[PDB]
Each structure stands twice: as C-alpha cells, then as structure tokens.
Amino acid sequence: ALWQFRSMIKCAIPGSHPLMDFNNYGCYCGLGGSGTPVDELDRCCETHDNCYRDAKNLDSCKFLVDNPYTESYSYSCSNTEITCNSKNNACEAFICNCDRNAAICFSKAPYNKEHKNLDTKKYC
C-alpha cells in the first residue's frame, strides 16, 4: 500500500523524504506518466508504473477501488535491506516486489535536481 512504499524508500535511502523527493520527478515519478523517462530515476518510476499495470492485469487479483496501492502487505526493513514477507498472498507479494524493486532502484539512480517538477507538457 502507498504508505508502505513511502517507508520502503526511507528504508533503502535513510536520509530521505519520499513524498518531497520522488513525487513529480521527471515524466513517471507521480500520478500516471507520459513519454520516455528522462532518467534512471524516472525509469525506476516507469517500471513501477508498469509493475502496477501487470498486477492490475492478473485475473486472480481484484484490488480495492482497483488500485494496487490500496493493498497492504507486510514487509520488514533491516538496515537498508527490504524483505517482503513470504507469507504475503500472491497479489500482495507481487505488489510488495514492485515497491521493493522500485525502492532498491531509487537508491541506485542518480538524483538530478533539474528534473524535480519537470514541465511534463513540454518534455514528456
């Protein structure tokens, strides 16, 4: 679920404020997305976006209000190491791994100040 992802990011990047850092970054860090990502970072967000598309597109999973973000899963974070509980059901595990992969991904992308609050209708 949304909040758990915010705190996955804080886990992988301790010195960080997710909502402020990774919302409206580039073309795909934020609601929806368009165009080609501008970045490794923005790429991590596009993949996450696509990861939520696949889960949405699994017959077995019927998310609340149709938004995988609504789906709480249960993880743990020991010193920059995210772990998705194995006892997550299949849909929760899939959502969990989208978030985790994205947090691992953000930890390793370069952050370019330039692309925070990008003019999306010009560059995306």
Ligand X SMILES: COC1=CC(=O)C=CC1=O
> Which residues are tagged catalytic?
48, 99
Nearest-angstrom CA–CA distance, 57 and 9: 25
Number of residues that bind ligand X (CB under 6 A): 8
- From candidates 77, 91, 104, 105, binder to its own copies by CB under 8 A: 91
7 binds Ca ion (CB under 5 A): no
Pick from 46, 57, 69: nearest CA to 124? 46
How would you class 73 by CB atoms within 10 Å of its CB: exposed for 0-12, middle for 13-18, buried for 19 or more?
buried
Beta carbons within 10 angstroms of residue 24's beta carbon: 13
30 assigned binding-site residue: yes
Binders of ligand X among residues 14 to 33 (CB under 6 A) are: 18-19, 22-23, 29-30
- By beta carbon distance, the residue nearest ligand X is 22
Instruction: Write each residue from 103 to 122 as x if it is in contact with its own copies (CB under 8 A), else as -, in one continuous string.
Output: --------------------
* The two structure tokens encoding residue 10: 């804080």
